[PDB]
Short mmCIF file of C-alpha atoms and ligand atoms in Angstrom, two decimals:
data_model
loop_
_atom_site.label_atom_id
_atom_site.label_comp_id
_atom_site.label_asym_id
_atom_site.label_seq_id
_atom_site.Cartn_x
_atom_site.Cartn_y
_atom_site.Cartn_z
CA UNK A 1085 -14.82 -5.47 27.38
CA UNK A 1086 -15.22 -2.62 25.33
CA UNK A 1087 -14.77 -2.91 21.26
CA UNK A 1088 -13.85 0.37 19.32
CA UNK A 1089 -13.01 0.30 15.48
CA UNK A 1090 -10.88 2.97 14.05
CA UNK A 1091 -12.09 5.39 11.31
CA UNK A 1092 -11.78 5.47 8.60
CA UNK A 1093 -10.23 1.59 8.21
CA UNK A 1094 -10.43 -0.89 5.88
CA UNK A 1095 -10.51 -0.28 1.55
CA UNK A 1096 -9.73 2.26 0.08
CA UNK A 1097 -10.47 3.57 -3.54
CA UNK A 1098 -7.24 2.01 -5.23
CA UNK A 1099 -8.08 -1.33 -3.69
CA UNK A 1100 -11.85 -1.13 -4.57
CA UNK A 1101 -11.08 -0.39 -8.17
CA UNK A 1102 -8.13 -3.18 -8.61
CA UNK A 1103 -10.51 -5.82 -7.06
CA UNK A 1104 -13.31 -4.98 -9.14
CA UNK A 1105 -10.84 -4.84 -12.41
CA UNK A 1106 -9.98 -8.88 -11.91
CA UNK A 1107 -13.25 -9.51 -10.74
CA UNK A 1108 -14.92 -7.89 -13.98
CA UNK A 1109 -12.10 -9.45 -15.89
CA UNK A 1110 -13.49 -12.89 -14.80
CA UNK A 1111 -16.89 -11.81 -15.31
CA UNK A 1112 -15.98 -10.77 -18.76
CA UNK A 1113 -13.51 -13.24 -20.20
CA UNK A 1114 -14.03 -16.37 -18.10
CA UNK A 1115 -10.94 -18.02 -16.16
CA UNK A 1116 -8.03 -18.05 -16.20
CA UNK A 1117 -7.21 -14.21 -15.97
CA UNK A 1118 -3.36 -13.92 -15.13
CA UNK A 1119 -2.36 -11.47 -12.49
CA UNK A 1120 1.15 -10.07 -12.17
CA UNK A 1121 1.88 -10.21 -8.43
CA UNK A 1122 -1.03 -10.21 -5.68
CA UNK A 1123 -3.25 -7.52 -7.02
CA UNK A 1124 -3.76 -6.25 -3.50
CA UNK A 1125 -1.50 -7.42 -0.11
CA UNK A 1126 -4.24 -9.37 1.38
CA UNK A 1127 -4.67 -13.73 2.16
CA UNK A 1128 -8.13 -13.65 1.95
CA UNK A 1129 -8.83 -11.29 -1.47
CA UNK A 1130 -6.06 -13.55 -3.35
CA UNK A 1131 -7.48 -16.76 -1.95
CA UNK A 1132 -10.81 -15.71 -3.27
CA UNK A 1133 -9.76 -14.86 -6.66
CA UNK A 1134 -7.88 -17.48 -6.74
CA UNK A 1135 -10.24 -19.87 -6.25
CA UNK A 1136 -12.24 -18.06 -8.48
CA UNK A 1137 -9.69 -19.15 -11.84
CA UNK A 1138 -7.20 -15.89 -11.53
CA UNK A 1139 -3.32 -16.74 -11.47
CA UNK A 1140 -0.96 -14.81 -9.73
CA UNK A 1141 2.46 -15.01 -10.91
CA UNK A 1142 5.76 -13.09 -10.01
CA UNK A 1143 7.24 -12.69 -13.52
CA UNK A 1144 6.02 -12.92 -17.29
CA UNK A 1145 7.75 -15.55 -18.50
CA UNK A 1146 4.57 -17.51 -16.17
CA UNK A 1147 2.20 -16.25 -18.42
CA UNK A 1148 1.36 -17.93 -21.60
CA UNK A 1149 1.50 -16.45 -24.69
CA UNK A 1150 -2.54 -14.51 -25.53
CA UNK A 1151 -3.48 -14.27 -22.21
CA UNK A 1152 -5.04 -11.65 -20.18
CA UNK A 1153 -2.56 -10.00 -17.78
CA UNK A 1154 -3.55 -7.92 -15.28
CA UNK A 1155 -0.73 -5.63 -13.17
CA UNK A 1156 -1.66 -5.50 -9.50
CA UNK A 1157 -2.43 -2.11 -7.65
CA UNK A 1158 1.04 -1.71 -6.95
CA UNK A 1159 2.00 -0.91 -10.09
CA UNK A 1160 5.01 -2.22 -12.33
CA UNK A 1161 8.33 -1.03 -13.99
CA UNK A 1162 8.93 0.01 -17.65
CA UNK A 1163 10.57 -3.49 -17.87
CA UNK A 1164 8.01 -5.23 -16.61
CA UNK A 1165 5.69 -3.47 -19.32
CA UNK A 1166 7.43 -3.29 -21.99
CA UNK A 1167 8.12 -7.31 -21.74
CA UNK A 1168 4.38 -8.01 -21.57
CA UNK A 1169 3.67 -5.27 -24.31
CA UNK A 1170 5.92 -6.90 -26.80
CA UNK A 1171 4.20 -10.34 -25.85
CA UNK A 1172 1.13 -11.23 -26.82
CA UNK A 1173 -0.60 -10.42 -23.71
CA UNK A 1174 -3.95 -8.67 -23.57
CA UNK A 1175 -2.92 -5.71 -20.87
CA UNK A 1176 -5.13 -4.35 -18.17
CA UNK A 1177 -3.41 -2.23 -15.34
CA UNK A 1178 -4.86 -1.97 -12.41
CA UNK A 1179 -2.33 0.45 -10.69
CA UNK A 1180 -3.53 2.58 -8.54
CA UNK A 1181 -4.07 6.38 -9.82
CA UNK A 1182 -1.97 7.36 -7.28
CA UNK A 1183 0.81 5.47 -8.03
CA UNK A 1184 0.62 6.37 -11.18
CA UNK A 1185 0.71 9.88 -10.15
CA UNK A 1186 4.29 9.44 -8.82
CA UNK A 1187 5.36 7.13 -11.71
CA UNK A 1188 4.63 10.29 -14.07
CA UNK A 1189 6.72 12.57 -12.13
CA UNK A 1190 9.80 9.54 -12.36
CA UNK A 1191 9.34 9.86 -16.11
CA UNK A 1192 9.45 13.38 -16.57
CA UNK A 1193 12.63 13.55 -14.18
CA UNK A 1194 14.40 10.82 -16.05
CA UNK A 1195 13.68 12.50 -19.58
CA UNK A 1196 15.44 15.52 -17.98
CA UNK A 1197 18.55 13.51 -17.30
CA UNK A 1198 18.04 14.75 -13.66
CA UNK A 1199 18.61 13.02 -10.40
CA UNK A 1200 16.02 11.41 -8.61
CA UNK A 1201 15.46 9.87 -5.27
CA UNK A 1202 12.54 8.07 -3.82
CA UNK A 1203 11.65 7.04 -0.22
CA UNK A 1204 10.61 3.86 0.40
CA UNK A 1205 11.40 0.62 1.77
CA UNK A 1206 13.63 -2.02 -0.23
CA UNK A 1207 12.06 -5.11 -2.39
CA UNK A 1208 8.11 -3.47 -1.82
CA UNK A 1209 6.55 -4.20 -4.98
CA UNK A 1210 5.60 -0.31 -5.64
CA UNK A 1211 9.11 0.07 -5.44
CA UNK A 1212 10.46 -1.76 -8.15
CA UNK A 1213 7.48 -0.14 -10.20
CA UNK A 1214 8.74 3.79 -9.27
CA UNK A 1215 12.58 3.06 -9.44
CA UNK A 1216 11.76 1.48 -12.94
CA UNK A 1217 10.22 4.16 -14.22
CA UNK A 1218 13.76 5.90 -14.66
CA UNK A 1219 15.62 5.25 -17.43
CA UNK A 1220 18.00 7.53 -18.48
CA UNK A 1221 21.91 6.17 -17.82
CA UNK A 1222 22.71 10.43 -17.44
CA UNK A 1223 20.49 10.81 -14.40
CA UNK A 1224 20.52 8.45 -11.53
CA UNK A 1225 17.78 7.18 -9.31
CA UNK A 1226 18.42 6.34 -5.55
CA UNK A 1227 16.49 4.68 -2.68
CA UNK A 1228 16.47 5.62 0.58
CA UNK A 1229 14.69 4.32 3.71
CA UNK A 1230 15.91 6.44 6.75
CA UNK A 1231 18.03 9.41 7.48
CA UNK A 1232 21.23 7.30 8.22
CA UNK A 1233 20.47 6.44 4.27
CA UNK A 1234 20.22 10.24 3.23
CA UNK A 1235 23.49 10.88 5.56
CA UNK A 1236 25.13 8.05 2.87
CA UNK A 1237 24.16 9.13 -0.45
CA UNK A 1238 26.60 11.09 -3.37
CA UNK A 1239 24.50 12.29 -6.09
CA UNK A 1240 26.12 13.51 -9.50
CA UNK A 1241 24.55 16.49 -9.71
CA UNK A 1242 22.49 18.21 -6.26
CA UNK A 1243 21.81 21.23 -8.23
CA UNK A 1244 19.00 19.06 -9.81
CA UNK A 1245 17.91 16.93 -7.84
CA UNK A 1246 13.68 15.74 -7.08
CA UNK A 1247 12.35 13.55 -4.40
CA UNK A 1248 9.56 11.00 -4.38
CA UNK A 1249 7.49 8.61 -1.75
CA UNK A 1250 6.14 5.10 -1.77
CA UNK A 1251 2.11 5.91 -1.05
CA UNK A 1252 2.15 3.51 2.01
CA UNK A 1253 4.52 4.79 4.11
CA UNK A 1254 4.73 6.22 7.87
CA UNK A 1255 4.28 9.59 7.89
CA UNK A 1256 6.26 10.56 10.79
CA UNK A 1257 9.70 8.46 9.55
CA UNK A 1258 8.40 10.06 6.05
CA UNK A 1259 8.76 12.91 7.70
CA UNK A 1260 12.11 12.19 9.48
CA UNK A 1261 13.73 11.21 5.83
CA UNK A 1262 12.31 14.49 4.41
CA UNK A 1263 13.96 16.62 6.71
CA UNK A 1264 17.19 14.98 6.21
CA UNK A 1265 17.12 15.49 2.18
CA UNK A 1266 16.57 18.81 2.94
CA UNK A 1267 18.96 19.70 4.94
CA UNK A 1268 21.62 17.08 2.92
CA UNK A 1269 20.75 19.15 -0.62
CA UNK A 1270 18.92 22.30 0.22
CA UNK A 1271 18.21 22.78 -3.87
CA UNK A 1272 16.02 19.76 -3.92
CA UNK A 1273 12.79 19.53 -5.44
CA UNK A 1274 9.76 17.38 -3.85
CA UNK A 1275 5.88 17.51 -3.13
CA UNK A 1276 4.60 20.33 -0.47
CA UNK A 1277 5.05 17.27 1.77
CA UNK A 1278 5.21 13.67 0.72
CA UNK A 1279 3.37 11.06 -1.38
CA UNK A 1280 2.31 9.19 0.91
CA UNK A 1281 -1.58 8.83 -0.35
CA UNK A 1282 -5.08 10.15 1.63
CA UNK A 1283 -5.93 6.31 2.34
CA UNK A 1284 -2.43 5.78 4.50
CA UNK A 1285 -2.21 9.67 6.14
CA UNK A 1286 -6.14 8.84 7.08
CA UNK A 1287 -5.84 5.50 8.36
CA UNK A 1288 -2.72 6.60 10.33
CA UNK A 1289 -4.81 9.95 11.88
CA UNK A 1290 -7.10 7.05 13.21
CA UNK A 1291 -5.17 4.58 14.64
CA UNK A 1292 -3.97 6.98 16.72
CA UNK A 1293 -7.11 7.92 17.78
CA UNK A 1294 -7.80 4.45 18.48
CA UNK A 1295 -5.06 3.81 20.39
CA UNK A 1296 -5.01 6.98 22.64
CA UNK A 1297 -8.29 4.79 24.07
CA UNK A 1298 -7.96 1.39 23.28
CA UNK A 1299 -5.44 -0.82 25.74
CA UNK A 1300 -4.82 -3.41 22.62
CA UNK A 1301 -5.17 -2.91 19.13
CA UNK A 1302 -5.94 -5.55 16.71
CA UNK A 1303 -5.04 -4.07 12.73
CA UNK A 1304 -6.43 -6.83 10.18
CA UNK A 1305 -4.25 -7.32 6.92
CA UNK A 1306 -1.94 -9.82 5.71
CA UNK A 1307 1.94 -9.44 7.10
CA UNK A 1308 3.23 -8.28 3.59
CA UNK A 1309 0.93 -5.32 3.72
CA UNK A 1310 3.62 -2.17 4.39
CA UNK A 1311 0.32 0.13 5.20
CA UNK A 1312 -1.23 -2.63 7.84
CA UNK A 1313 2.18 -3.04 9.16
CA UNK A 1314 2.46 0.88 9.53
CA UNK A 1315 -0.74 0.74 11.25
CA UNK A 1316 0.03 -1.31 14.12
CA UNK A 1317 3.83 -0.25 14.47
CA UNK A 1318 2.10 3.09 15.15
CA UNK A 1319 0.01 1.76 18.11
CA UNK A 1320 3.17 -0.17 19.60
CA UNK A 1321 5.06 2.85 19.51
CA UNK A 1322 2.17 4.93 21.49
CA UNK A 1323 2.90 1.65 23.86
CA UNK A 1324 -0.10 -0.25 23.37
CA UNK A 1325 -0.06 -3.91 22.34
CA UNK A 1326 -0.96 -4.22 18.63
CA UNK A 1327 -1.14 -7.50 16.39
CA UNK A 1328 -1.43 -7.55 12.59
CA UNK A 1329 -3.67 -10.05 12.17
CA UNK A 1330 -5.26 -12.05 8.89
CA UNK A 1331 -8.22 -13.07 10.64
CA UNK A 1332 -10.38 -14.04 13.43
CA UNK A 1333 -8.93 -17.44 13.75
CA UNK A 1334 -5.45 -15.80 14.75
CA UNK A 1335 -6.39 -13.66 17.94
CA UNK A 1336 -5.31 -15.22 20.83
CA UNK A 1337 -7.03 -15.23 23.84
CA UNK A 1338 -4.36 -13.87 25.90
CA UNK A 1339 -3.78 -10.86 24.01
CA UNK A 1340 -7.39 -9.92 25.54
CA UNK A 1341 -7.83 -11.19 28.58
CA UNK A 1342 -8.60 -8.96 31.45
CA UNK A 1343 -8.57 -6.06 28.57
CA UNK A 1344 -11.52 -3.32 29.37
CA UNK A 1345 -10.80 -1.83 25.43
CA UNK A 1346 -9.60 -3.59 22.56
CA UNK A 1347 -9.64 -1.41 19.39
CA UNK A 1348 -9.73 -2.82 15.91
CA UNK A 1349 -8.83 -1.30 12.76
CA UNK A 1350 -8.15 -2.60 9.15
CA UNK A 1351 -5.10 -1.92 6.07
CA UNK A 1352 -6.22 -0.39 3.34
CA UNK A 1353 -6.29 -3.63 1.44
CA UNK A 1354 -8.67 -5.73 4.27
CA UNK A 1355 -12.05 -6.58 3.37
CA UNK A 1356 -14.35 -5.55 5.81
CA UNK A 1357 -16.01 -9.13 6.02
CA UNK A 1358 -12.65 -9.84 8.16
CA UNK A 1359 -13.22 -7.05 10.48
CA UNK A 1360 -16.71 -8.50 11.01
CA UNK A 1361 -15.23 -11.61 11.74
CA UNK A 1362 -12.58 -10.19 14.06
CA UNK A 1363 -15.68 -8.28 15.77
CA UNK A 1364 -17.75 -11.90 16.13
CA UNK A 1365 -14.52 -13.36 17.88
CA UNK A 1366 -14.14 -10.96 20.53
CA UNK A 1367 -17.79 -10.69 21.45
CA UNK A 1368 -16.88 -14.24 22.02
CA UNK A 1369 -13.97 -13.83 24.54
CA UNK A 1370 -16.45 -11.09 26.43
CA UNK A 1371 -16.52 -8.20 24.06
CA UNK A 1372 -19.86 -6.01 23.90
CA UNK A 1373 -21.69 -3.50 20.59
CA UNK A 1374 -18.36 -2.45 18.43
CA UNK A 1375 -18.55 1.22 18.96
CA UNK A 1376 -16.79 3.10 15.95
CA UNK A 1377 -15.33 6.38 16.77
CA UNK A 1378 -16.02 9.20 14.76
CA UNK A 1379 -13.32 10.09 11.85
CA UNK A 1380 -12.85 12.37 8.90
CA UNK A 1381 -14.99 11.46 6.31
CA UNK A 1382 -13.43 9.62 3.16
CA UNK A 1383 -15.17 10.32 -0.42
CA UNK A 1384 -12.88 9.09 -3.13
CA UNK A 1385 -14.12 6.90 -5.62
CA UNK A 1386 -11.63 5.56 -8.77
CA UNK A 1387 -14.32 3.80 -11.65
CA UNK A 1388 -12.56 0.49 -13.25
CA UNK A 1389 -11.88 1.68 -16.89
CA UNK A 1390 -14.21 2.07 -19.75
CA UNK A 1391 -13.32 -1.67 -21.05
CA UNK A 1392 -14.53 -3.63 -18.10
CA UNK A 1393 -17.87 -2.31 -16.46
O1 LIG B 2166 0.46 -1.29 1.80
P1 LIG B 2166 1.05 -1.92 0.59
O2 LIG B 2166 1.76 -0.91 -0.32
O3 LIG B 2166 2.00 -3.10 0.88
O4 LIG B 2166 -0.08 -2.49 -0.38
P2 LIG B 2166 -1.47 -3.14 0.06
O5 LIG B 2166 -1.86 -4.04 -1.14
O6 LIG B 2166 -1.52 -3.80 1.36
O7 LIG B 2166 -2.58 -1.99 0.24
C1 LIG B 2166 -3.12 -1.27 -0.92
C2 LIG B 2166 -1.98 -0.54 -1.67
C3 LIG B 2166 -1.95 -0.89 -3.18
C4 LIG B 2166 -1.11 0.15 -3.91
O8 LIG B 2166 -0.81 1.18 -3.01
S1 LIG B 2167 -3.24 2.62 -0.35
FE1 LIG B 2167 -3.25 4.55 -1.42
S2 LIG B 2167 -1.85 4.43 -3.23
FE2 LIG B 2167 -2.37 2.33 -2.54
S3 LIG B 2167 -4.29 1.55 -3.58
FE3 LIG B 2167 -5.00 2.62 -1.76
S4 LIG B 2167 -5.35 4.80 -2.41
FE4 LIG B 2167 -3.95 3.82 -3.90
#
């Protein structure tokens, strides 16, 4: 059996630099370090860390007063913010630049008192942190997930009117959704394209590659990871058998047998030890070398601030 791994898979520079933030943080400090929601979507890095003295907790009221808070990648809502800000929490954010990126353009439409809506799916951490960076009662902010969603929606004002993506979205329904806002308010206002970040668009460019050649595809990350999830919806839908997996442990032996190419690829929030792992395990069940395939080159680095090298 032949073993291909997708490229580029595995971390990317948001999820490098929000590691290395609570890790540093621990380094620095000492446990505990308090983390608002699981800095990253992955079992094994909040396991680690957790073992390591950090505390993840959903709200603030978990969090005792002079801690050290961290916010996860994901980033967090005005709210959330504002209630750790006037506690006394020491603050570091580890949301990803690119989130942040979006969250600024929220802002600026909300001081405008002009509509906003954002793609992206319901209850996903990132968001709660872009919807709540809109404030103003004038305005309005709206999510939607699909077209049916866009065919719903009555806006106050489609004259002004912007658009805005989660970063780890599909970007062909992306796509799909974009069309329909544009052709639903023609005056809207939006990116060239989407935000949907270089880590997810890259990752997606080589799973499909993968899976034009691979007869199975195993993705690693955890099942609350929307960009892992994205990954191996878009190998099912090119009609290849894909799992989402945590680990090595979880392949089953069926999913492989009599397979001549399994490919394996990795969320952006999967450390690569568990693609190693997932590599050992099928060069158990008759897999040969893992060949990785060739992919666009990724060079983005994001340093951890100032405050914790
Ligand atoms: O893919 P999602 O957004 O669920 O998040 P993740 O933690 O799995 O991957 C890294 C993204 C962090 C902020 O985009
Ligand atoms: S997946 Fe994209 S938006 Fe999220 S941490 Fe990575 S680079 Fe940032």
């Amino acid at each position: 059996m032949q073993i291909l791994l997708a490229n580029p898979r595995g971390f990317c520079a948001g999820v490098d630099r929000a590691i290395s933030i609570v890790e540093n943080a621990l380094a620095i400090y000492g446990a505990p370090i308090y983390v608002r929601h699981e800095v990253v979507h992955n079992r094994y890095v909040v396991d680690s860390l957790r073992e390591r003295g950090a505390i993840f907790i959903e709200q603030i009221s978990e969090v005792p007063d002079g801690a050290i808070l961290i916010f996860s990648a994901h980033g967090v809502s005005q709210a959330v913010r504002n209630e750790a800000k006037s506690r006394d929490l020491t603050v570091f954010d580890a949301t990803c630049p690119l989130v942040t990126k979006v969250h600024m353009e929220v802002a600026r439409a909300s001081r405008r008192g002009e509509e906003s809506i954002l793609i992206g799916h319901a209850g996903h951490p990132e968001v709660e942190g872009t919807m709540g960076q809109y404030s103003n009662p004038e305005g309005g902010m709206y999510l939607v997930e699909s077209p049916d969603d866009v065919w719903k929606l009555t806006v106050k004002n489609e004259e002004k009117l912007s658009f805005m993506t989660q970063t780890t979205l599909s970007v062909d329904d992306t796509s799909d959704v974009i069309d329909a806002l544009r052709k639903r308010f023609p005056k809207i206002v939006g990116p060239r394209k989407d935000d949907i970040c270089y880590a997810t668009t890259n990752r997606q460019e080589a799973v499909r590659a993968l899976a034009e050649q691979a007869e199975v595809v195993l993705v690693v990350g955890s099942k609350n990871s929307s960009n892992s999830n994205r990954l191996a919806e878009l190998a099912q839908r090119m009609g290849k058998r894909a799992f989402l997996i945590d680990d090595a442990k979880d392949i089953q032996e069926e999913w492989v047998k009599e397979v001549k190419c399994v490919g394996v690829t990795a969320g952006a929030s999967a450390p690569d030890i568990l693609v190693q792992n997932v590599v050992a395990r099928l060069q158990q069940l008759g897999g040969g070398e893992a060949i990785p395939l060739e992919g666009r080159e990724e060079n983005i680095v994001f340093e951890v601030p100032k405050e914790l090298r």
